[PDB]
Each structure stands twice: as structure tokens, then as C-alpha cells.
Amino acid sequence: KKISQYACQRRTTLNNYNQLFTDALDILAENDELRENEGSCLAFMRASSVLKSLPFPITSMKDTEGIPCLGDKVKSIIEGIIEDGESSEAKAVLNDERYKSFKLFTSVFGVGLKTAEKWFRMGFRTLSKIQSDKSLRFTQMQKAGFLYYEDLVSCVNRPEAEAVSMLVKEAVVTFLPDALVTMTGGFRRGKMTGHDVDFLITSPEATEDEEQQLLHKVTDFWKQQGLLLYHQYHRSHLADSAHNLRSTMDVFERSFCILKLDHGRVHSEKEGKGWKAIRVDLVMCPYDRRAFALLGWTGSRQFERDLRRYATHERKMMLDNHALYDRTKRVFLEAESEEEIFAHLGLDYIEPWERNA
Ligand SMILES: Nc1ccn([C@H]2CC[C@@H](COP(=O)(O)OP(=O)(O)OP(=O)(O)O)O2)c(=O)n1
Numbered sequence: 001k002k003i004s005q006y007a008c009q010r011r012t013t014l015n016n017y018n019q020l021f022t023d024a025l026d027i028l029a030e031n032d033e034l035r036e037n038e039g040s041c042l043a044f045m046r047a048s049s050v051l052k053s054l055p056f057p058i059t060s061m062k063d064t065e066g067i068p069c070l071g072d073k074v075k076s077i078i079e080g081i082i083e084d085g086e087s088s089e090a091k092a093v094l095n096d097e098r099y100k101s102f103k104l105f106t107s108v109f110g111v112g113l114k115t116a117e118k119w120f121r122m123g124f125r126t127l128s129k130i131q132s133d134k135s136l137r138f139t140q141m142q143k144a145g146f147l148y149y150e151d152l153v154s155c156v157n158r159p160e161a162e163a164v165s166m167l168v169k170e171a172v173v174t175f176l177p178d179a180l181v182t183m184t185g186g187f188r189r190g191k192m193t194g195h196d197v198d199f200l201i202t203s204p205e206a207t208e209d210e211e212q213q214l215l216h217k218v219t220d221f222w223k224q225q226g227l228l229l230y231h232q233y234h235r236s237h238l239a240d241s242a243h244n245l246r247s248t249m250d251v252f253e254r255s256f257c258i259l260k261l262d263h264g265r266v267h268s269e270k271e272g273k274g275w276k277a278i279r280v281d282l283v284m285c286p287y288d289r290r291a292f293a294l295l296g297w298t299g300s301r302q303f304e305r306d307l308r309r310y311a312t313h314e315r316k317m318m319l320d321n322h323a324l325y326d327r328t329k330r331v332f333l334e335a336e337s338e339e340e341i342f343a344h345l346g347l348d349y350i351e352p353w354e355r356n357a
């Protein structure tokens, strides 16, 4: 059984035997991202992903034999960890002022690479200096980011994700009683924590106007209930989906929210102000596209990249979050399940908890 270069042909659980190596590769990948060296970034992400799939810890360079996605640079990183138990390259990145600033500034919701670079070239290094600066101007998203900073850096746990799921279902069924609400993202893959809580909403009987209006009704409901702290709508691009017939362009309508989650709704083993701000991502898809949407929104991000790369390079197929197109047969392939999509691709089925690539 030769290890495939594709994450969609590997089983990746959360039982990682190479966390010393992958933690260092992840820092090195993030450094190339924040510095826009996309090629080097992709090589580090692919190397980290394949080590996450190994059923044993690397203890010598002989263990790397036959493993794909491990270049010369990655190999010297791995060598460095075998000898010392630490990466000199990743340590230098953690000590780098541009990396430290970019990591700290982008940890504010609403702050991307352009705003982070701008603050860094103005000589800013702390969030205290940014927030007290008289001349800086913040976007509405950045203001929410600063207001709810501590709650948002603190990640979401599974008990909080289930409390959000309850509010999502409760909101949705008010307008569409037959709607199916599925928790997607990291939590569907078995993650204990997440940066947000992802959801896919679909209805067997909703009309084009009903499905196109549901997300707007759900946020108005939360605004009326005093639970909406921030929101941003994302219009559907299903009529422009052919952009994916050549990362992916998002095709479904989405509502991104920041929700006020009272402690009393959370059923955990566990104060101050009895509520926490949570990032909630709500995706609405037409019923016949639900299998493609579920596969696309479950992730991981690397698993998605490899599913698409595999479809193109190995099967002359074009996969995106709403469909699968066969370039040879000149037809879209239908699927009512993720299992049917994997079968169409000629891939052994991978469970959501095995998609942690
Ligand atoms: N605009 C987007 C955002 C996300 N996704 C996919 C990629 C994986 C999945 C969930 O995205 P994230 O919430 O960012 O990731 P996650 O795997 O849930 O990890 P995290 O804990 O950071 O939320 O949806 C997508 O197709 N289009």
C-alpha cells in the first residue's frame, strides 16, 4: 500500500504521531502565507498533511522512504527535529517581528494581510497601540473584531457548537419547518474545538425565492431576539459557477454571523458576563446540490484542495461545492450522498473523521 500524494486517497484522523514535525511545518507554511510565497506555503502544507496521516512517529530519515510530498527543504526541517527535538527554522519564524505582528494583527476578526502590513509599516507592534491610535479608521467588521476580541480568540468547544446548533435549528424551522440543518467544518470531522461553527441548511420543498430569502429571515429573527452582534451576507454565485470549470469560488448564499451565546444554553462540565460571542457560518444550498455542498463544507481545507486536484489531474473531472462535471462524457454526474461523489471519482469512501488532512 503506497502512500498517495492526494489527501483524498489517505485516511487522516486526529491521532497525529508526528505533531513535533507538523507543528513546525504549519508555522513555516503560515510564514510563507503571511509573506505571500504561495509555492513554498503549498509545499509545507502538503508535507504537514502527509505526516498527519502516518500511523507511526518518524524517528530516523529511513522512515521518510516512500513518503510523497517531502522535498529537500522539508527533509532538512525533519532532520533538524530528529537531532534536537526542535526546529531552528520554525524557532526563527516565531522570533520574527513581521511574523509576530502579522499573526497578532490577523487574529483580530476583520483584519487581513493588507491591513496587517499597513499597521506594521506604520511601526505598530501591539493591539493596544492600534486601538488607542487617534488617526486610524476601522471597518465595521474590524470594530466587531476588537469589541469581541477575547471571546473570538478563545476557540469554540463542542458544547458551545451544540448550543449554537439548537439556536440555528430553532431559527430556521420558524420559516422552513422541513429544513435539514447539518453542522459542517471541523466539528463534523470530530474536532473538539473550532474557530467558528459551520452549518449547511437545505430544504426538500423550499422554492427558489424561499431558499434565497431564508438566511435574511434567520438573521432578522436573531436581530429581533437580541442575539446578533454582527452579520455579513454573501450572495449566491450559482449562475457564475462555470468559473470553477477551469482554491474554489464560493457558489452558495451564505450568512456569516457573530452570535451572543448565553452560558445557560451551554451544557458542559463547567463567570462574569454570562455570554460569549461566537462566529457562525450559515450556508444555504438548493436541495439537489446538498451532497456536493456537504462534501465541500466538511473540509479539511487540504482535503478539498486534493479532491479538486485529483478530479482534474486523474479523472478529467471538474469538482466544486455544487457539482461534478465529466469533461470526457460532457455531463454533470448526480449524487444524493457523499458516498456517490467518491464512487463517481473512483475513490474509496473517506469518513468525515478521516478528512483531517
Ligand atoms: N468560504 C469558504 C469557507 C470555507 N469553506 C470550506 C473549507 C472547509 C470548511 C469549513 O471552513 P472553516 O470554518 O474555515 O474551517 P474548519 O475546517 O471548520 O476549521 P476551523 O476550526 O478553523 O473552523 O468549509 C469553503 O468552501 N468556502
Ligand SMILES: [Mg+2]
Residues within 6 Å of the ligand: 185, 186, 187, 194, 195, 196, 197, 198
Ligand atoms: Mg470551521
Ligand code: NA
Residues within 6 Å of the ligand: 105, 106, 107, 108, 109, 110, 111, 112
Ligand atoms: Na483575521
